[PDB]
Enzyme design. Structure first.
Site, PDB file in Angstrom:
ATOM      1  N   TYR A 138      93.959  24.800  25.810  1.00 56.28           N
ATOM      2  CA  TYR A 138      93.544  26.204  25.790  1.00 56.28           C
ATOM      3  C   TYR A 138      92.427  26.532  24.785  1.00 56.28           C
ATOM      4  CZ  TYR A 138      97.215  27.401  29.156  1.00 56.28           C
ATOM      5  OH  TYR A 138      98.000  27.473  30.286  1.00 56.28           O
ATOM      6  N   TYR A 161      95.948  36.689  22.381  1.00 57.17           N
ATOM      7  CA  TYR A 161      97.120  36.034  22.987  1.00 57.17           C
ATOM      8  C   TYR A 161      97.219  34.542  22.679  1.00 57.17           C
ATOM      9  CZ  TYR A 161      93.709  34.703  26.551  1.00 57.17           C
ATOM     10  OH  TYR A 161      92.603  34.203  27.189  1.00 57.17           O
ATOM     11  N   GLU A 207      90.582  18.524  31.248  1.00 54.76           N
ATOM     12  CA  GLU A 207      92.034  18.692  31.140  1.00 54.76           C
ATOM     13  C   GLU A 207      92.751  17.398  31.488  1.00 54.76           C
ATOM     14  OE1 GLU A 207      92.744  22.122  33.557  1.00 54.76           O
ATOM     15  OE2 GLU A 207      91.665  23.449  32.175  1.00 54.76           O
ATOM     16  N   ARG A 257     102.154  32.310  41.784  1.00 54.89           N
ATOM     17  CA  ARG A 257     102.351  33.394  40.821  1.00 54.89           C
ATOM     18  C   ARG A 257     102.670  34.692  41.539  1.00 54.89           C
ATOM     19  NH1 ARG A 257      97.676  32.759  36.171  1.00 54.89           N
ATOM     20  NH2 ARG A 257      98.149  30.571  35.609  1.00 54.89           N
ATOM     21  N   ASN A 292     103.853  32.549  33.393  1.00 54.00           N
ATOM     22  CA  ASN A 292     103.367  32.586  34.752  1.00 54.00           C
ATOM     23  C   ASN A 292     103.460  31.230  35.457  1.00 54.00           C
ATOM     24  OD1 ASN A 292     101.183  31.377  33.428  1.00 54.00           O
ATOM     25  ND2 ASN A 292      99.780  33.122  33.755  1.00 54.00           N
ATOM     26  N   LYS A 334     104.765  25.112  33.623  1.00 55.13           N
ATOM     27  CA  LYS A 334     105.054  25.713  32.323  1.00 55.13           C
ATOM     28  C   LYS A 334     106.571  25.813  32.010  1.00 55.13           C
ATOM     29  CE  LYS A 334     100.586  28.071  32.268  1.00 55.13           C
ATOM     30  NZ  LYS A 334      99.918  29.409  32.058  1.00 55.13           N
ATOM     31  N   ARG A 369      94.052  25.950  42.971  1.00 53.61           N
ATOM     32  CA  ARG A 369      93.818  27.179  42.210  1.00 53.61           C
ATOM     33  C   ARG A 369      94.212  28.407  43.004  1.00 53.61           C
ATOM     34  NH1 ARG A 369      91.421  30.859  37.947  1.00 53.61           N
ATOM     35  NH2 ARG A 369      93.001  30.019  36.509  1.00 53.61           N
ATOM     36  N   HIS A 408      99.706  26.324  35.484  1.00 54.99           N
ATOM     37  CA  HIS A 408      98.249  26.241  35.279  1.00 54.99           C
ATOM     38  C   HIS A 408      97.614  25.252  36.254  1.00 54.99           C
ATOM     39  CE1 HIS A 408      94.353  25.473  33.204  1.00 54.99           C
ATOM     40  NE2 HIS A 408      94.566  24.266  33.700  1.00 54.99           N
TER      41      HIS A 408
HETATM   42  O1  LIG Z   1      96.803  38.417  28.096  1.00 57.21           O
HETATM   43  C1  LIG Z   1      97.066  37.224  28.279  1.00 57.21           C
HETATM   44  C2  LIG Z   1      96.229  36.428  29.070  1.00 57.21           C
HETATM   45  C3  LIG Z   1      96.448  35.057  29.130  1.00 57.21           C
HETATM   46  N1  LIG Z   1      97.643  34.540  28.687  1.00 57.21           N
HETATM   47  C4  LIG Z   1      97.983  33.103  28.908  1.00 57.21           C
HETATM   48  O2  LIG Z   1      96.849  32.258  28.797  1.00 57.21           O
HETATM   49  C5  LIG Z   1      96.621  31.545  30.007  1.00 57.21           C
HETATM   50  C6  LIG Z   1      95.123  31.491  30.260  1.00 57.21           C
HETATM   51  O3  LIG Z   1      94.675  32.812  30.456  1.00 57.21           O
HETATM   52  P1  LIG Z   1      93.831  33.189  31.766  1.00 57.21           P
HETATM   53  O4  LIG Z   1      93.415  34.618  31.711  1.00 57.21           O
HETATM   54  O5  LIG Z   1      92.673  32.264  31.900  1.00 57.21           O
HETATM   55  O6  LIG Z   1      94.828  33.054  33.044  1.00 57.21           O
HETATM   56  P2  LIG Z   1      94.840  31.887  34.173  1.00 57.21           P
HETATM   57  O7  LIG Z   1      93.508  31.290  34.425  1.00 57.21           O
HETATM   58  O8  LIG Z   1      95.784  30.827  33.721  1.00 57.21           O
HETATM   59  O9  LIG Z   1      95.291  32.508  35.425  1.00 57.21           O
HETATM   60  C7  LIG Z   1      97.378  32.308  31.097  1.00 57.21           C
HETATM   61  O10 LIG Z   1      97.822  31.485  32.147  1.00 57.21           O
HETATM   62  C8  LIG Z   1      98.526  32.925  30.332  1.00 57.21           C
HETATM   63  O11 LIG Z   1      99.628  32.051  30.332  1.00 57.21           O
HETATM   64  C9  LIG Z   1      98.481  35.334  27.903  1.00 57.21           C
HETATM   65  O12 LIG Z   1      99.477  34.861  27.363  1.00 57.21           O
HETATM   66  N2  LIG Z   1      98.199  36.673  27.697  1.00 57.21           N
HETATM   67 MG   LIG Z   2      91.773  31.096  33.243  1.00 57.25          MG
END
Ligand SMILES: O=c1ccn([C@@H]2O[C@H](COP(=O)(O)OP(=O)(O)O)[C@@H](O)[C@H]2O)c(=O)[nH]1
Ligand SMILES: [Mg+2]
Ligand SMILES: O=c1ccn([C@@H]2O[C@H](COP(=O)(O)OP(=O)(O)O)[C@@H](O)[C@H]2O)c(=O)[nH]1
Ligand SMILES: O=c1ccn([C@@H]2O[C@H](COP(=O)(O)OP(=O)(O)O)[C@@H](O)[C@H]2O)c(=O)[nH]1
Ligand SMILES: O=c1ccn([C@@H]2O[C@H](COP(=O)(O)OP(=O)(O)O)[C@@H](O)[C@H]2O)c(=O)[nH]1
Ligand SMILES: O=c1ccn([C@@H]2O[C@H](COP(=O)(O)OP(=O)(O)O)[C@@H](O)[C@H]2O)c(=O)[nH]1
Ligand SMILES: O=c1ccn([C@@H]2O[C@H](COP(=O)(O)OP(=O)(O)O)[C@@H](O)[C@H]2O)c(=O)[nH]1
Ligand SMILES: [Mg+2]
Ligand SMILES: [Mg+2]
Ligand SMILES: [Mg+2]
Ligand SMILES: [Mg+2]
Ligand SMILES: [Mg+2]
Lengths: 132, 133, 132, 133, 132, 132
Positions: free
Chosen positions: D52, D60, D125, D101, D111, D11, D88, D114
């Site tokens: 996404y 968000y 993806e 992370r 963060n 990212k 993952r 991905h």
């Molecule tokens: O409250 C939130 C939750 C998600 N995200 C963003 O959207 C992505 C996908 O969300 P998810 O909860 O699935 O997190 P991940 O699977 O990437 O750990 C995240 O990596 C964050 O960058 C965000 O900006 N605000």
């Molecule tokens: Mg997720």
């Protein structure tokens, strides 16, 4: 001020798992990636263009074969005095503190190519990133 | 024995780039010891101008003081054998890979770290930063 | 959002040359130094205040003696959710990936103190940085 | 054998903080191999919105797409045994030290990385980022 | 709670140049080497004894072959709670923060053996270091 | 240009927990361990033989004492131009980028010995590894 330079990560970096290590050293010196390509196998004509100044040397064909023996990454890096500073970071296998100095011990298999002048840079960037 | 003290400044660009521990770690791993340390969220320009007084007549003098007050600095007194010259070598320059500036800096001004370059510089810089001599 | 937390680097980090290592781990998680002091030898009353909730424990005097056996650094760190996140980074000697998990193996000599709550934080910051 | 491919995005916050090699190095050291990689100086928002898409109805969603186009990204196809689930786990979360992370990120949005979370996510993806299937 | 434990560094660690990396993680946790042998190729008998508990399992022969396909180092380590701690340091290929967690991705080629109990530790120490 | 060379890892490396760090720098440069012994305390005779060339110098006795004050590891390393390369890796306490350059600051306690010539390498290998 700002220069751009061409870097090749060579197939030995992939075999030895040193790709991030080498890239990390350029990153920590504050150089930025402008362009990047991954080549699972680079076309031979690109390698031969890239090394054309070496076409008459005894090592020429063998080095090309090496360069085609695994993946390469070509990167355009940008930063202040990029050509000369990335060259110094590359170093040689006799100079501790440099990439080749810390991590390489071979005449051919030496991990990293960096442009050595403004002209070679411009030319090498056009070989690997001709869209420009 | 051969024991010396030297003055080191961690510059604002180190805080900016998250390199503070990296720099200190390089000095730590060479077996030098912290004797005094201060954190300045912003250093008084007066102190900087004193620290860089030998430079007061150069073109870069004012731009550098500006940079030196543009974010935090840490001033450290280090101790060990031949500390002044050894920590100076660690600092190195932007052209010499293997040293702190060599590995991590790419600018004439923003170069992460200062070390005293002589016994005379050290006594004077320590006095500037740790006046409680 | 933003919290501040109190961190002590303990005398064992100085003896074992792990001060930058520990600090580096908090730095890499994006926490910023708001305040910092180095103590070649911390006054005993400060240590005793800091550990006052432990005054009745069998380890209390011995831990204080340890805490006064070499230098300490007290730091106020700032960042999102600083109290809990720096606590998790500290971890324990059974949890690989944490500071104590990777680097410590003792009940007492465990490198790093971090505030464990909002109240302990506010109180501990006032002990080491009473100018505020 | 047990061989899988997965999709990883580095990212914009990684480029900002100079963490790109650190992240890739963590995946490299676990013996996963790059199969395809692209550097995007700025990614088309269309691609991000697809990537996404399962998130299109969350608060968000728009702030995140904004962030995702605020600087460079690298998209990588990695290959190795159990690659989807192992990479993952490497990614982890901002609460678990030892993961990417866990060690390096402190925000719900910014963060650093991905990774695909399933065989189905990965196929989709990879198709988004490397349409030359 | 001082204990000794037996560690084997496996041939994949030599192949991947992870020897010092693995030993460093144990060193940094404050464990000490009490004895150490380098084997360019371990006697197959030693390997069969070492993995005797597994002689009936389907992976036994392949594993023995693997363990003899390159060098190994056998190390006796000492420190507080050494058996349990070095086992946790070893970890598994799922959880990051450990040796295997960070560096391995295979059910067979997983870089490091560590004793898992007081009995196996006594046993394995006697296999590799019979002179006690 | 394949050579073998003798390396000693000195007691200060054990004291400072730099063993794996030092071995890793050699490993990363692609040199291989051919044999290795761990000595909890080296026989003083071995140390006197090892530093025989220095028997008339003023630091001889103190150095022998130092070399027996803690563990050492003796290693035979192999690789292209190994003697010269590992010597450069060893370096000196002045120039950063080397083992001594980065990690040592003493005329006596300097972490690592490496053979400096073809003759001393044959000699020192026979002192520590007589079985050849
Ligand atoms: O409250 C939130 C939750 C998600 N995200 C963003 O959207 C992505 C996908 O969300 P998810 O909860 O699935 O997190 P991940 O699977 O990437 O750990 C995240 O990596 C964050 O960058 C965000 O900006 N605000
Ligand atoms: Mg997720
Ligand atoms: O005897 C040689 C000299 C060079 N090369 C290869 O060709 C490249 C270009 O040669 P040069 O001498 O210009 O080295 P460089 O500029 O990259 O340091 C080297 O990096 C080697 O990979 C080789 O294989 N054998
Ligand atoms: O052209 C210049 C030269 C110097 N400096 C700054 O002034 C300090 C002192 O200059 P000097 O040439 O003595 O460099 P140093 O001894 O610190 O390596 C340097 O560290 C730089 O930060 C600058 O801003 N521009
Ligand atoms: O049996 C014990 C328990 C604690 N401590 C010391 O006292 C501190 C505070 O105790 P606590 O159990 O709260 O550990 P922490 O919260 O720091 O993890 C520890 O960090 C140790 O240094 C000790 O010396 N002996
Ligand atoms: O399916 C398997 C399971 C185990 N092993 C090997 O056998 C060793 C012992 O097996 P165990 O399940 O006890 O693993 P460990 O206790 O070392 O984690 C492992 O380290 C592997 O190298 C294998 O080759 N195939
Ligand atoms: O004044 C001295 C010089 C040397 N040595 C020790 O003796 C060894 C051999 O001395 P030499 O000058 O040959 O050092 P080297 O070749 O190992 O750099 C050094 O490594 C030091 O440990 C010492 O104790 N005092
Ligand atoms: Mg050239
Ligand atoms: Mg100067
Ligand atoms: Mg507590
Ligand atoms: Mg088992
Ligand atoms: Mg000598």
């Amino acid at each position: 001020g700002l220069q751009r330079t061409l870097v090749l990560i060579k197939p030995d970096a992939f075999e030895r798992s040193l790709v991030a290590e080498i890239m990390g050293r350029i990153e920590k010196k504050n150089f930025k990636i402008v362009s990047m390509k991954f080549w699972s196998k680079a076309p031979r004509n690109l390698i031969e263009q890239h090394y054309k100044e070496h076409s008459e040397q005894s090592y020429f064909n063998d080095n090309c074969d090496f360069m085609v023996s695994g993946p390469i990454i070509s990167i355009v890096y940008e930063g202040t005095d990029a050509i000369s500073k990335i060259r110094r970071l590359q170093g040689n296998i006799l100079t501790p503190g440099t990439i080749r100095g810390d991590l390489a011990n071979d005449i051919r298999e030496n991990l990293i190519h960096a442009s050595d002048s403004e002209d070679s840079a411009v030319d090498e960037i056009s070989i690997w990133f001709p869209e420009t």
